[PDB]
Amino acid sequence: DPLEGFNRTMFNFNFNVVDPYVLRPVAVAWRDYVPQPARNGLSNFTSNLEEPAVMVNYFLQGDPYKGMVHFTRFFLNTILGMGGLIDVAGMANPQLQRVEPHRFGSTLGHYGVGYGPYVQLPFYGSFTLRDEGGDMADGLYPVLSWLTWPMSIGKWAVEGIETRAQLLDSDGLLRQSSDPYILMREAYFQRHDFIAN
């Protein structure tokens, strides 16, 4: 952790001002006024744009099975399920149940590549080079390639407000630990390694 000094700084900016004054209020508004069918209807839709990328990426990892599983997700949900708003593939099989995506970031880490320094950015939060920034490769080919740069920042934000709400309970579970920066960096590496391996 080279930039441990810098990262702790941007984590404070994030933990103690941009979250409780901005992100966490915006997320509270989301939880109260957006009706549930709309909320999971929206994350069904944004996550559909990643399914062709995950299919391509599981092929590049030598798992044609899971790669065609995520094809099926995209195919079934775009065509029958109203352009990704309805999860027919999951209502279909339990083997089509949505799981969290495996993008180029994981293809690098599957084929052995490391990250670099774990950095913490203001307003972004956590960032590594291999996974974030490596997932941008999936921006070079269709569905994710068709998103204008306004559409990307919107998908970032809509997803951001959703995830940020889906943590409003374990809110204090981070606020109640001696070093909440190191729990937040160990939770990042728990999730990001689990995916590649």
């Binding site: 009706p35 109203m82 279909a92």
Partner: protein, 340 residues
């Protein structure tokens, strides 16, 4: 009707045989509905499979066989497949079906389309969103995702069908509807708009690059009583045909009013009364001209759920010198119906 039900797939093969006759003055050329034999048959299947606790797949097809054609050259006249579509339904999340199906503006016009033979004059077939049309994808959701009870909506897409006649053609379009139903009462409105074919634009009657249809409806449907009313307007959508100049096309505007009252006696008879008016506006070379204007009195006797009979008298109030040529004589129908 349900003739197969095994391994979660069930198949409903349904039909009817209707002996129909129309009575109108003279040959019937100047009638609301015409004159002579009107007998037809109907066949179809409604299939529905329980894929799992959330998924019900479904498909349906329905044909119209005319009984009033000879066995020679005219044998196929009026024969048509009416509906043909398949789809998927998700556990209180909605439904989706594509094919030839009812247009969305019928979600409102159905309120008044309850007459024994006629009525529902604005729900033209192959006319954008008011009737059965080919190549529609439809999202519908009932009870608003399980939350709001009795609140349905629906949104629909119309793929262009560039056909041989202007009448039956249409461009790309989209429409939708919302209804609320609560204790016998119902309110609904619906709207659609679409592009017109170059064929439709090169028509003498009608002008505009976009056709547009909306309608709204109220109903009371409880305690053997049925009362319903519909208002809607079209811009560039109702197909009209000028009998004098032998031209076709569309009305640039119409305002459409329909009302229906019916009682269901416990001894079997269901009388019906109705008023229907369709006023066209800004019509090429005419201006304001009535298209539909009649009162109706009718009744149906229900022997049981499979056998019935009906008479339907249309008091045609269209004028004798209608500038578009709409027939101004009355028409009365007598029908006997076996269905299954």
């Amino acid at each position: 009707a349900e003739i197969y039900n095994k391994d979660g797939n069930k198949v409903d093969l349904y039909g009817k045989a209707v002996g129909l006759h129309y009575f109108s003055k003279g040959n019937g050329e100047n009638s609301y509905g015409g004159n002579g034999d009107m007998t037809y048959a109907r066949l179809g299947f409604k299939g529905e499979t329980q894929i799992n606790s959330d998924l019900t797949g479904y498909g349906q097809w329905e044909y119209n066989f005319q009984g009033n054609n000879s066995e020679g050259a005219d044998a196929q006249t009026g024969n048509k497949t009416r509906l043909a579509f398949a789809g998927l339904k998700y556990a209180d999340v909605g439904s989706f079906d594509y094919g030839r199906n009812y247009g969305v503006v019928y979600d409102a016009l159905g309120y008044t389309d309850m007459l024994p033979e006629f009525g529902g004059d604005t729900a033209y077939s192959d006319d954008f969103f008011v009737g059965r049309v080919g190549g529609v994808a439809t999202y519908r959701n009932s009870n608003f995702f399980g939350l709001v009870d009795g609140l349905n909506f629906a949104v629909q897409y119309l793929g262009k069908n560039e056909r041989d006649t202007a009448r039956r053609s249409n461009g790309d379009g989209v429409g939708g509807s919302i209804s609320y139903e609560y204790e016998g009462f119902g309110i609904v409105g619906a709207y659609g708009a679409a592009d017109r074919t170059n064929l439709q634009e090169a028509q003498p009657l009608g002008n505009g690059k976009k056709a547009e249809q909306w309608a709204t409806g109220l109903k009371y449907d409880a305690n053997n009583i049925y009362l319903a009313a519909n208002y809607g307007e079209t811009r560039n959508a109702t197909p009209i045909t000028n009998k004098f100049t032998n031209t076709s096309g569309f009305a640039n505007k119409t305002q459409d009013v329909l009302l229906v009252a019916q009682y269901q006696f416990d001894f079997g008879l269901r009388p019906s009364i109705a008023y229907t008016k369709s006023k066209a506006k800004d019509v090429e070379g005419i201006g304001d001209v009535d298209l539909v204007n009649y009162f109706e009195v009718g009744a149906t006797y229900y022997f049981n759920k499979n056998m019935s009979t009906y008479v339907d008298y249309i008091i045609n109030q269209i004028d004798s010198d209608n500038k578009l040529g709409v027939g101004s004589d009355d028409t009365v129908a007598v029908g006997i119906v076996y269905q299954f």
